[PDB]
Design a protein around this ligand. Structure first.
Ligand SMILES: CCCCCCCCCCCCCCCCCC(=O)OC[C@H](CO[C@@H]1O[C@H](CO[C@H]2O[C@H](CO)[C@H](O)[C@H](O)[C@H]2O)[C@H](O)[C@H](O)[C@H]1O)OC(=O)CCCCCCCCCCCCCCCCC
Ligand code: CLA
Ligand code: CLA
Ligand code: CLA
Ligand code: CLA
Ligand code: CLA
Ligand SMILES: CCCCCCCCCCCCCCCCCC(=O)OC[C@H](CO[C@@H]1O[C@H](CO)[C@H](O)[C@H](O)[C@H]1O)OC(=O)CCCCCCCCCCCCCCCCC
Ligand SMILES: CCCCCCCCCCCCCCCC(=O)OC[C@H](COP(=O)(O)OC[C@@H](O)CO)OC(=O)CCCCCCCCCCCCCCC
Ligand SMILES: CC1=C(/C=C/C(C)=C/C=C/C(C)=C/C=C/C=C(C)/C=C/C=C(C)/C=C/C2=C(C)CCCC2(C)C)C(C)(C)CCC1
Ligand SMILES: CC1=C(/C=C/C(C)=C/C=C/C(C)=C/C=C/C=C(C)/C=C/C=C(C)/C=C/C2=C(C)CCCC2(C)C)C(C)(C)CCC1
Ligand SMILES: CCCCCCCCCCCCCCCCCC(=O)O
Ligand SMILES: CCCCCCCCCCCCCCCCCC(=O)O
Ligand SMILES: CCCCCCCCCCCCCCCCCC(=O)O
Ligand SMILES: [Fe+2]
Lengths: 39, 341, 36, 505, 115, 31, 36, 63, 30, 82, 34, 32, 33, 30
């Protein structure tokens, strides 16, 4: 049985992972572009 | 040179606003605690949870606005936006107190972020991490006052609300219900805060009035070069001055500045302990020996018994409006009052 | 067969004065509550 | 020399004397357990598990023995009120004694490892310096913790080989020690399902056995060994405190809110049972039933067990206490002796009134009686000159049903008033105040004292985690910063990445 | 009153008769002493963090400062570097004299206002 | 209704006149 | 880049805050919150 | 130092001081179990909190 | 007994002051 | 030293800056004003307007008294108002 | 030669632009009548 | 006043024990 | 039993004060050598 | 309280015997 708050639980679970996903994709992207230079 | 080492490189770039790995936790959580508070003091009511106006929109001013705590019937619910109380309905979330837990918990994780940032920056610059350590006292206050204290009571209703006058109400609540001025853990806290301010003033003033003449101008701030080797004031003359004025003096600059971290940090930690007790109504309310004598001897009066009459006034006069879910109805005739007043 | 990790311990006079004062003031503070 | 707050650091590179210190600490803790249990047996009154249960008597360790199945004294009593029982060796006395004996043996082992500190086992075969391979130790200890945890769950709690655990009905009337079957479903996570405790330890135990084997067999990666400084034992101290304060908060939490492991018959009620009139509801439901089967009021209140009514009393609420109000609860309101009966209050019009109960926040509380609707109908006034609701004006009476006073009715306002002042506390009981010279002021229960101490220790241990954590990660500058530290590393814009000198210009 | 509980009696009755909590000068007093404790912990912790290595791990670091020594025992450039990055570079002091005048001035003015 | 549209109308005229006056100085961010 | 002198932005900035803030004290006496 | 019988039996368990798996070894897999543990602690907390309500689970004494 | 205890502890603190001021470690310049 | 960015002294005195922000700052101020004057802030956040704290003949506050039926309690007070 | 879109840009505009929105919102509230 | 009898022993040892600790450490510091 | 209430503190100090005196003297002896 | 005192003192004497025997000043010839 899937209850309303389990449906709510999953929503928040999936919202959190999406937020976290984006943040780190943006940040890996930016960091691959604007690379620090060493000599 | 993985994607990890390259991400690490960008987070740890020197820029106007250092980010770091800790930034991923700090900046979102701080920003949302902040935004939640401004949003809520600006647009959100406390009508359905406390019976109170609480925003500018409703006519409150800077002093009287607050993000108030949730209703007592929510208990300790996380009060998530998708949880079973609001059910994803944002407007009803605001009406139910959701911004309070939202600020409380994002701010909690924002503080973690900040402490981690102090460790992170300390490690990169090569300095000991005593500033992170000092910050453990603010964290201990936040956790004990905003989290542990309500967790021990019936609900978050009784935690502090996020407002200037809301906090004053909390002060007075603590006086009349917990007799918190009588608590030796708060007394230590006072001593460490007042003691800290004393040390701040006395040290700052001592250095400003034992400076060496390192320049020829009347404004003495220009005669200091941030890379000079030499002390800019005289430990020796300061020392002799306080020895002869107050009896003893510092003689060790390291001990002095460690004493300055120690005092207020230790002060706040002690007060946090006392509030943990008050989570449980484990108060220092009474002195039993005084009550026994007072009961028997109607002529025995002290400042302790007098203060307890004041608390009895605070409780009965403030309870019906402060704790409205209780539906306290107190006829005029049961209200404690002295003569005439 | 002496143990190489032994170290001497110190407490200078000023630390005694600080410590003695801490304890005395803690006693003055908490005694009223011990008697209750 | 060493400052006083550092004296114990002489153990850091001395694994043998570290074991010795650790044995002495264990010797002390086991010794305390035994001492505490003996003092508690010297002072425990077993003659009344209804109105004088262990939690009224300031008994702290007695309920942890009872919790896992030790229930009887060699003197023949049991905490369930049975007489003439044979506990065998594992009575409270035998448990106390095993811990003293264990303490003494650990004391001797401590002397041996202190004197013979220079064992070859502790030297790195390569280099001959003291070395401890902590990843392997963790794996070993984890494996062991897993076996114990599995075995505690599989044999002790199930009663397959062992006594089970304390279990009770929802109102703490009929507790006892029973084998408990594991709850493998989702209710196993219901903190009030004792089966979940069994299932927890079987499964977690297996998970530990597996995890310990993995940690015995697989070395930590270089990245992690460097990041967490795994060659430094203070790293283990730092994470160990962290887990300890996490655990300390959880057991404070579950002790304050209740759970299947903190039952009300060993630790007292929770504050939430008073908040929600939990026991009052159940008492009333029983009265409503009895009256359905057409019993008199007297008959239906006469049927409420005293144990149940005792729970409906604010003097057993653990949030009624004080930090320096010391000792057993019996030192406060007294040794409870009898239910006086349920008090029914009536005004001159025949209508029944209800004393408004004291909420836990309030050291003192006015006496206010309302009707079934919550309209104020009587009070005890402060200023009398304009009182409308006084007991004298409203002809308030009190009649008792059940208890010592069953069938009695009092009409003289002085008497009615005193029962009304007790009724803000819930059900009214007869107390012996003479025996302990009780002073009349509420104490907290062991549930409160336990929670206060563990919450406080958990907070302090957070500070030690931060402290030892920072000493692990900043060991290189513990005595100070580099006396010849470049100003280019701390001025802005010299290095593109902070702290890294290879990013210059 | 000259007494611990008498001080509290005084504070409670003052609040009844004047709403000192709602008075901006008492709000400045709180800012003065909270802030003074803050800047006390800050300054202590920041000088403490940037003590130059002069000692080993077995001795109090306090033995690295000698009474009357001419040189400073901490790297203020390091402390500014740490604290400038914790916030931003100009929120942090680079001039000990400004820094110590700030420490004197803030609580003193606060307490003037509350007095 | 119409209200969600007026409270957001002036804000788009803000992002246009700051994109059209920083459209060139924004594009050299190229390599 | 530098064409508008700093002291003039300051003066202007300062007066706009003086207006918003003054507006708020006005509102203390009129409308919601004025007690009237 | 001093050899002993128990010493010699236990010797190999305390002999790999400093041995490490190259590089990142099992870190990715560690991260996964942590992820699951989180999710699962989150579930236990929200059941206790009555934010997650499940059929047949009655978080009350009346269990 | 309680009055004596309070006064005893206060008395000791005042002694401590005397030694702390007149019998301090003297600060010296090297 | 300079972490790299353009100084604030130089931006806020630059004409280009005031071209851009002459427009943006008042547009946000005006959007914020409209947010309240259209009455939209009340409906987003559930804040009573001055006429909707109490029904006409009632003096009791609409306090939420149940955790899980709570959003339904509030909906109910809002209808006992039309 | 400076960039104009920086982390700092985002930083200041993440506070700056809601602050103005909010201020004009609060300006309007001074003209609400009961 | 009906104070708590064990208050006296608690205050006595609270002072005595840690004070003695410091004195022992201080004295053995001077004698070297 | 109805024993003298001050027997306890009399006993505690009778042990503590002389014992502590000897411990002070011994420890500062041992750290001369 | 009297019982605990007697057993405490007795137990300290036993501990002392242990230290006096096994952690004595070793007697050394000249
Ligand atoms: C320092 C480092 C800094 C780190 C800070 C970072 C921030 C982390 C975020 C923390 C999140 C906190 C969530 C706590 C929610 C909570 O507790 O929520 C409370 C719930 C329990 O719910 C409460 O339960 C109570 C008792 O109910 C029970 O008892 C009743 C009695 O009649 C009935 O039987 C009822 O059915 C039955 O449920 C009442 O119902 C309350 O209204 C209801 O809120 O527990 C639960 O979620 C779980 C409780 C298990 C323990 C959880 C561990 C945390 C506890 C630490 C605090 C201990 C403090 C004790 C005081 C000292
Ligand atoms: C810095 C990050 C951050 C953090 C730490 C938080 C933290 C929190 N927020 Mg906030 N939030 C954030 C950013 C953040 N937020 C942002 C950017 C926004 C704007 C959209 C919001 C908007 C927001 C709202 C509107 C609300 C919160 C709420 C909350 C709380 C509930 C969180 C929750 O249940 O997540 C659950 C989700 C997770 C824990 C993520 C799990 C990720 C995966 C699935 C792990 C599983 C691993 C997988 C199985 C294996 C893969 C392993 C992997 C390593 C490869 C919590 C206090 C709520 C609150 O305060 O309620 C009172 C709330 O209502 N947040
Ligand atoms: C079917 C298998 C099964 C079953 C039925 C259970 C059943 C249970 N587990 Mg076990 N578990 C299992 C397998 C299983 N487990 C396995 C395989 C593992 C991995 C080894 C675990 C690991 C595990 C842990 C680590 C914990 C449990 C706990 C529990 C209990 C949860 C109820 C409770 O009181 O939670 C209460 C506990 C929580 C709600 C978690 C606390 C969450 C808070 C937020 C953390 C605190 C954070 C922060 C430090 C606090 C700051 C303080 C401030 C906020 C106030 C229950 C007996 C919990 C327990 O023992 O509780 C006593 C617990 O802590 N389980
Ligand atoms: C030789 C074995 C042994 C046995 C059978 C007992 C038995 C008992 N002791 Mg004794 N005890 C022992 C050794 C033993 N003790 C030792 C060596 C000491 C000194 C350290 C003590 C100190 C001691 C004290 C101080 C007390 C007892 C008490 C008790 C009773 C209750 C125990 C209890 O509630 O534990 C509960 C224990 C726990 C909840 C700890 C669980 C472990 C936590 C969760 C750590 C988890 C970390 C782990 C590594 C993670 C694993 C992960 C997993 C996935 C694998 C019981 C009669 C109590 C009593 O009544 O005494 C009179 C009491 O207060 N004992
Ligand atoms: C986890 C710890 C714990 C807990 C919860 C309990 C709980 C309990 N014990 Mg047990 N007890 C313990 C440890 C514990 N004990 C230990 C270790 C001992 C040996 C000393 C005893 C010895 C003992 C005896 C002899 C008796 C009890 C009794 C009791 C009960 C009454 C408690 C009471 O009045 O407290 C009073 C508590 C206080 C007044 C709190 C004092 C804390 C002060 C404020 C010190 C902290 C200040 C500090 C100096 C600050 C410095 C700051 C600086 C760092 C800067 C209660 C159930 C009594 C009982 O009824 O048993 C039958 C009883 O007679 N216990
Ligand atoms: C498992 C727990 C644990 C362990 C093994 C250690 C071990 C250590 N700590 Mg850490 N520490 C811990 C917990 C722990 N700590 C916690 C919880 C805190 C926060 C309060 C700290 C805070 C802390 C600081 C701030 C420092 C240490 C230091 C040290 C080292 C020297 C300690 C010493 O010589 O004390 C000597 C202590 C004394 C001679 C007397 C102490 C008297 C105390 C105040 C009261 C006694 C309590 C009493 C006996 C009852 C026991 C309490 C128990 C029931 C919980 C040693 C490695 C020091 C260090 O890093 O050295 C470099 C240091 O500066 N610790
Ligand atoms: C680039 C940098 C960008 C900076 C971002 C800034 C982030 C932090 C901003 C936090 C500031 C909080 C100020 C809130 C004050 C406020 O708006 O008052 C807004 C209130 C509005 O005034 C109220 O308006 C109501 C409208 O119905 C009623 O008319 C009330 O009677 C009236 O008091 O103003 C004040 O109360 C008077 C001035 C307050 C001065 C506060 C001093 C702060 C210390
Ligand atoms: C010194 C006393 C301390 C009080 C502070 C006043 C300092 C102010 C000061 O004196 O410095 C003045 C400084 C000088 O900047 P420029 O070199 O660009 O300009 C030089 C001109 O002053 C010459 O006329 O300007 C700033 O840095 C403005 C700061 C606004 C920056 C807004 C950034 C938003 C930051 C977001 C939060 C940051 C992270 C926080 C941690 C999470
Ligand atoms: C909550 C939430 C969220 C978020 C939000 C946010 C983020 C917000 C923000 C907001 C903001 C960010 C705001 C701001 C505000 C501001 C203002 C309101 C200001 C004011 C100011 C002032 C008033 C000032 C003035 C002055 C004074 C007072 C004194 C001195 C001088 C001067 C002039 C400076 C989300 C989305 C997730 C959703 C969910 C919920
Ligand atoms: C040798 C030997 C023996 C014997 C043994 C014995 C005799 C033991 C005992 C032991 C014991 C008898 C022990 C005890 C101990 C205890 C302890 C360990 C304690 C602790 C405590 C504490 C720690 C406290 C603290 C506190 C206080 C004081 C106040 C309040 C607060 C607190 C709680 C914190 C035998 C024959 C067997 C065998 C052979 C050998
Ligand atoms: C059935 C439940 C009601 C409908 C659900 C709609 C609610 C959607 C709101 C989601 C907002 C995302 C906030 C969580 C993001 C941050 C979480 C984290 O990083 O820890
Ligand atoms: C005498 C009547 C009862 C029968 C005696 C039963 C025998 C003893 C049972 C005690 C079991 C405790 C086992 C705990 C496991 C710990 C093992 C270990 O640490 O070495
Ligand atoms: C109740 C008695 C108070 C406690 C006594 C504390 C005794 C601790 C003293 C430890 C000092 C040993 C110093 C080392 C002496 C030998 C090396 C020089
Ligand atoms: Fe300084």
């Amino acid at each position: 049985t899937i209850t309303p708050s389990l449906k709510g639980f999953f929503i928040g679970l999936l919202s959190g992972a999406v937020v976290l996903g984006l943040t780190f994709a943006v940040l890996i992207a930016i960091s691959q572009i604007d690379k620090v230079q060493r000599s | 040179r993985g994607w990890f080492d390259i991400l690490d490189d960008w987070l740890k770039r020197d820029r106007f606003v250092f980010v770091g790995w800790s930034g991923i936790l700090l900046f979102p959580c701080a920003y949302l605690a902040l935004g939640g508070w401004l949003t809520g003091t600006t647009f959100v009511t406390s009508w359905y949870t406390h019976g109170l106006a609480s925003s500018y929109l409703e006519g409150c001013n800077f002093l009287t606005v607050a993000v108030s705590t949730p209703a007592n019937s929510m208990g300790h619910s996380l009060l998530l936006l998708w949880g079973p109380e609001a059910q994803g309905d944002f407007t009803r979330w605001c009406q139910l107190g959701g911004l309070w837990t939202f600020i409380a918990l994002h701010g909690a994780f924002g503080l973690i972020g900040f402490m981690l940032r102090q460790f992170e920056i300390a490690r990169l610059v090569g300095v000991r991490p005593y500033n992170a350590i000092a910050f453990s006292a603010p964290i201990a206050v936040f956790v004990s006052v905003f989290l542990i204290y309500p967790l021990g009571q019936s609900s978050w209703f009784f935690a502090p609300s996020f407002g200037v006058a809301a906090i004053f109400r909390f002060l007075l609540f603590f006086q009349g219900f917990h007799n918190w001025t009588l608590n030796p853990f708060h007394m230590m806290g006072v001593a460490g805060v007042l003691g800290g301010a004393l040390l701040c003033a006395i040290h700052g003033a001592t250095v400003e009035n034992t400076l060496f003449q390192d320049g020829e101008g009347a404004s003495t701030f220009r005669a200091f070069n941030p890379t000079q080797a030499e002390e800019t004031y005289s430990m020796v003359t300061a020392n002799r001055f306080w020895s002869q004025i107050f009896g003893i003096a510092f003689s060790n600059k390291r001990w002095l500045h460690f004493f300055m971290l120690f005092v207020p940090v230790t002060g706040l930690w002690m007060s946090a302990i006392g509030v943990v007790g008050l989570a449980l109504n484990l108060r220092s309310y009474d002195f039993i020996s005084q009550e026994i004598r007072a009961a028997e001897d109607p002529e025995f009066e002290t400042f302790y018994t007098k203060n307890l009459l004041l608390n009895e006034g605070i409780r009965a006069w403030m309870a019906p409006q402060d704790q409205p879910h209780e539906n306290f109805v107190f006829p005029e005739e049961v209200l404690p009052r002295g003569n005439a007043l | 067969e002496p143990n190489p990790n032994r170290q001497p311990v110190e407490l200078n006079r000023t630390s005694l004065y600080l410590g003695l004062l801490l304890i005395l003031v803690l006693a003055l503070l908490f005694s009223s509550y011990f008697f209750n | 020399g060493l400052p006083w707050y550092r004296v114990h650091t002489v153990l850091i590179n001395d694994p043998g004397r570290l074991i010795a210190a650790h044995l002495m600490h264990t010797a002390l803790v086991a010794g305390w357990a035994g001492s505490m249990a003996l003092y508690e047996l010297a002072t425990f009154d077993p003659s009344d598990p209804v109105l004088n249960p262990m939690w009224r008597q300031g008994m702290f360790v007695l309920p942890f023995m009872a919790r896992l199945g030790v229930t009887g004294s060699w003197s023949g009593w049991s905490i369930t009120g049975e007489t003439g029982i044979d506990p065998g060796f594992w009575s409270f006395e035998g448990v106390a004694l095993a811990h003293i004996v264990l303490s003494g043996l650990l004391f001797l082992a401590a002397c041996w490892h202190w004197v013979y500190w220079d064992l070859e086992l502790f030297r790195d075969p390569r280099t001959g310096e003291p070395a401890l391979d902590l990843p392997k130790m963790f794996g070993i200890h984890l494996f062991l913790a897993g076996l114990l945890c599995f075995g505690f769950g599989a044999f002790h709690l199930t009663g397959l080989f062992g006594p089970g655990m304390w279990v009770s009905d929802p109102y703490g009337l009929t507790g006892s020690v029973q084998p408990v079957a594991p709850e493998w479903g989702p209710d196993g996570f219901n903190p009030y399902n004792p089966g979940g405790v069994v299932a927890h330890h079987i499964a977690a135990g297996i998970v530990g056995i597996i995890a310990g084997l993995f940690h015995i067999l697989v070395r930590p990666p270089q990245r992690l060994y460097k990041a967490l400084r795994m060659g430094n034992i203070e790293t283990v101290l730092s994470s160990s405190i962290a887990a300890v304060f996490f655990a300390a908060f959880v057991v404070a939490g579950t002790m304050w809110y209740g759970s299947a492991t903190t039952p009300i018959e060993l630790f007292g009620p929770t504050r939430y049972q008073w908040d929600s009139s939990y026991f009052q509801q159940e008492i009333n439901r029983r009265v409503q039933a009895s009256l359905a089967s057409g019993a008199t009021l007297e008959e239906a209140w006469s049927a409420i067990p005293e144990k149940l009514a005792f729970y409906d009393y604010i003097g057993n609420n653990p949030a009624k206490g004080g930090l320096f109000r010391t000792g057993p609860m019996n030192k406060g309101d007294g040794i409870a002796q009898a239910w006086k009966g349920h008090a029914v209050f009536r005004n001159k019009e025949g209508e029944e009134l209800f004393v408004r109960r004291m909420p836990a926040f309030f050291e003192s509380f006015p006496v206010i009686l309302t009707d079934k609707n919550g309209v104020v109908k009587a009070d005890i006034p402060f200023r009398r000159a304009e009182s409308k609701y006084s007991f004298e004006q409203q002809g308030v009476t009190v009649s008792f049903y059940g208890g010592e006073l069953n069938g009695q009715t009092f009409t003289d306002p002085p008497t009615v008033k005193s029962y009304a002042r007790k009724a803000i506390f819930g059900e009214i009981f007869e107390f012996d105040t003479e025996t302990l010279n009780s002073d009349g002021i509420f104490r907290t229960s062991p549930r409160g004292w336990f929670t206060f101490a563990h919450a406080v220790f958990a907070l302090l241990f957070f500070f030690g985690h931060i402290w030892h954590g920072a000493r692990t990660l900043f060991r290189d500058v513990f005595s100070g910063i580099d006396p010849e530290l470049s100003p280019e590393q701390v001025e802005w814009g010299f290095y593109q990445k902070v702290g890294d000198v290879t990013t210059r210009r | 009153p000259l007494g611990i509980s008498g001080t509290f009696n005084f504070m409670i009755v003052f609040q009844a008769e004047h709403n000192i909590l709602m008075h901006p000068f008492h709000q400045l007093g709180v800012a003065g002493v909270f802030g003074g404790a803050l800047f006390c912990a800050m300054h202590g912790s920041l000088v403490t963090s940037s003590l130059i290595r002069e000692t080993t791990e077995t001795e109090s670091a306090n033995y690295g400062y000698k009474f009357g020594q001419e040189e400073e025992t901490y790297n203020i450039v390091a402390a500014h570097g740490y604290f400038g990055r914790l916030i931003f570079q100009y929120a942090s002091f680079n001039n000990s004299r400004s820094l110590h005048f700030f420490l004197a001035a803030w609580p003193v003015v606060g307490v003037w206002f509350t007095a | 209704d119409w209200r969600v549209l007026v409270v957001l109308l002036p804000v788009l005229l803000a992002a246009g006149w700051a994109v059209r006056n920083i459209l060139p100085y924004a594009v050299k961010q190229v390599q | 880049g530098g064409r508008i002198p700093l002291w003039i932005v300051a003066t202007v900035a300062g007066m706009g805050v003086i207006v918003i803030v003054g507006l708020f004290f006005y509102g203390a006496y009129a409308g919601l919150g004025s007690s009237l | 130092a001093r050899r002993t019988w128990l010493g010699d039996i236990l010797r190999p368990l305390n002999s790999e001081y400093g041995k490490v798996a190259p590089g990142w070894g099992t870190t990715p897999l560690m991260a996964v179990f942590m992820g699951l543990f989180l999710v699962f602690l989150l579930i236990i907390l929200e059941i206790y909190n009555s934010t997650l309500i499940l059929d047949g689970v009655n978080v009350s004494w009346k269990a | 007994m309680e009055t004596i205890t309070y006064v005893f502890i206060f008395a000791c603190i005042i002694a401590l002051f005397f030694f702390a001021i007149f019998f301090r470690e003297p600060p010296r310049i090297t | 030293g300079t972490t790299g960015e353009r100084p604030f002294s130089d931006i806020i005195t630059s004409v280009r800056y005031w071209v851009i922000h002459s427009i943006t700052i008042p547009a946000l101020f005006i959007a914020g004003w409209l947010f309240v004057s259209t009455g939209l802030a009340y409906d987003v956040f559930g804040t009573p307007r001055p006429d909707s704290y109490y029904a006409q003949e009632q003096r009791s506050i609409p306090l939420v008294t149940d955790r899980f039926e709570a959003k339904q309690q509030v909906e109910t007070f809002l209808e006992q108002l039309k | 030669s400076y960039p104009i879109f920086t982390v700092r840009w985002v930083a200041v505009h993440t506070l700056a632009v809601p602050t103005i929105f909010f201020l004009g919102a609060i300006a309007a509230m001074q003209f609400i009548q009961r | 006043m009906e104070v708590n009898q064990l208050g006296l022993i608690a205050t006595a040892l609270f002072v005595l024990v840690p004070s003695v600790f410091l004195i022992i450490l201080y004295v053995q510091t001077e004698s070297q």
